[PDB]
Amino acid sequence: KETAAAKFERQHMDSSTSAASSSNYCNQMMKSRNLTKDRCKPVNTFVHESLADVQAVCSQKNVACKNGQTNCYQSYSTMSITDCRETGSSKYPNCAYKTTQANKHIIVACEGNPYVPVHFDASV
Ligand SMILES: Nc1c[nH]c(=O)[nH]c1=O
């Protein structure tokens, strides 16, 4: 039964590319990572850094989570990410996404032993 940490990796890690490959990046990735299985997940972010670098964020700048919990952390450096956002025209099961590359600080929630990312909270 997929752990929270594995789920974070599936939903949010893509070290294989350095930045939104193409205009159809999100279309392919949202599907291949099984984020369009039961619905069109409206919004999702992929991080293009090493797993080590992203895991390291859990020991970086402690900030409040959007839900009010205290276990969020913001990266000291900007990281290469891609946001995926469902287009107005998107209709399940043909989930359509706008692919946007950027370089931003990430905020993740971390839990467990080992203390690792289990939720992507925001980019800033
Ligand atoms: N706010 C967010 C929630 N979840 C994501 O994957 N990306 C975001 O930017």
Curated annotation (Swiss-Prot):
Entry-listed glycosylation sites: 34
E.C. no: 4.6.1.18
Keywords, comma-separated and alphabetical: Disulfide bond, Endonuclease, Glycoprotein, Hydrolase, Lyase, Nuclease, Secreted
Enzyme class: lyase
Region of interest (Disordered), ranges: 1-22
Localization: Secreted
Protein name: Ribonuclease pancreatic
Species: Bison bison
Protein's gene: RNASE1
